[PDB]
């Protein structure tokens, strides 16, 4: 299905909701448009205004918290929106960054409604919502030059110390952070070297089987698949494929099941990958 001309300016992110029925899009026009997609039919519900610059990404909160969406933008703010009775309205704002905010991701639901935020100021902020409504955020210096992405690890399978998330920055590193009670915040677990240029995205696989999988995608035109078998053990570096991709890679995304990766590059192409016996990666559906 296609939804043509959703915006006039370039669209930077399009994310469906927990049901794969509703969808949000953000653009350089500075708005977020919400659509309801049925079969091969769709309907624009509303346009969200408020941001003062391009909107880079958006994410949907788990349904048990209601119909909520988070957005981040060049303006350095994260805005929270909600749909109450077919109508949307800004319900909160997070603005602790001195530069562009590049990603925002809702935490696994068991954790309550939490927001992981990455900014070009070099910091990451973790935000939850008080009973009253406002927010109390955790701020950490995570990368020199900038942070471009931060993705949550799946919830361990209610202890808070087991919460981890991975970041990727313009210093070429991929980092792993874990919450520590004593420190009252997230602390550095590992630093993963393997890129020669800015990491543009990192995604942790939700896969529920022995090994943990994370993917870093870079300006150096590579995709690394990190794996770990032991909780405190080292992460193994495995190039998605031996040769550089035609262009820069911007996003990586895992399937809910099957552990299938979907890569997005500069040649505006999207490749699907799966892991074989040899523990290596190959196309998951009719290559092109």
């Amino acid at each position: 299905v296609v939804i043509a001309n959703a915006h006039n300016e370039m669209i930077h992110d399009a994310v469906m909701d927990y049901y794969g029925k509703r969808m949000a899009t953000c653009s350089s026009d500075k708005t977020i448009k919400i659509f309801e997609v049925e079969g091969e039919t769709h309907k624009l519900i509303d346009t969200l205004t408020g941001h003062e610059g391009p909107v880079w990404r958006v994410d949907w909160a788990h349904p048990k918290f209601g119909t909520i969406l988070a957005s981040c933008s060049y303006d350095g703010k994260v805005m929270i929106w909600k749909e109450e009775n077919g109508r949307w309205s800004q319900i909160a704002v997070h603005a602790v960054h001195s530069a562009s905010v590049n990603s925002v991701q809702w935490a696994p639901h068991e954790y309550g409604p939490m927001l992981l935020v990455a900014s070009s100021d070099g910091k990451v902020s973790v935000v939850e919502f008080k009973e009253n409504g406002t927010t109390s955020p955790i701020i950490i210096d995570a990368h020199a030059i900038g942070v471009n992405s931060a993705s949550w690890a799946p919830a361990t399978i209610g202890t808070k110390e087991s919460r981890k998330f991975v970041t990727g920055g313009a210093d070429n590193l991929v980092k792993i952070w874990k919450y520590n009670s004593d420190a009252q915040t997230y602390v550095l677990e590992s630093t993963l070297e393997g890129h020669s240029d800015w990491v543009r995205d990192v995604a942790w696989s939700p896969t529920v089987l022995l090994r943990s999988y994370m993917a870093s995608v870079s300006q150096d035109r590579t995709c690394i698949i990190w794996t770990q078998d032991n909780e405190q053990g080292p992460w193994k570096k495995t190039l998605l494929k031996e040769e550089k991709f035609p262009d820069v890679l911007w996003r990586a995304s895992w399937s809910l099941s099957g552990n299938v990766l979907a890569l997005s590059g500069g040649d505006n192409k999207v490749t699907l990958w799966k892991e074989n016996l040899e523990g290596k990666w190959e196309p998951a559906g009719e290559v092109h």
């Binding site: 994310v15 469906m16 911007w250 996003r251 895992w254 299938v260 979907a262 505006n268 192409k269």
Partner: peptide, 18 residues
């Protein structure tokens, strides 16, 4: 730093690719 074109693909429930 910003605004480069990209497919920004994401998997969605039901086996959908956006």
């Amino acid at each position: 730093w910003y605004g480069e074109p990209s497919p920004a693909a994401h998997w969605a429930f039901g086996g959908k690719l956006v």
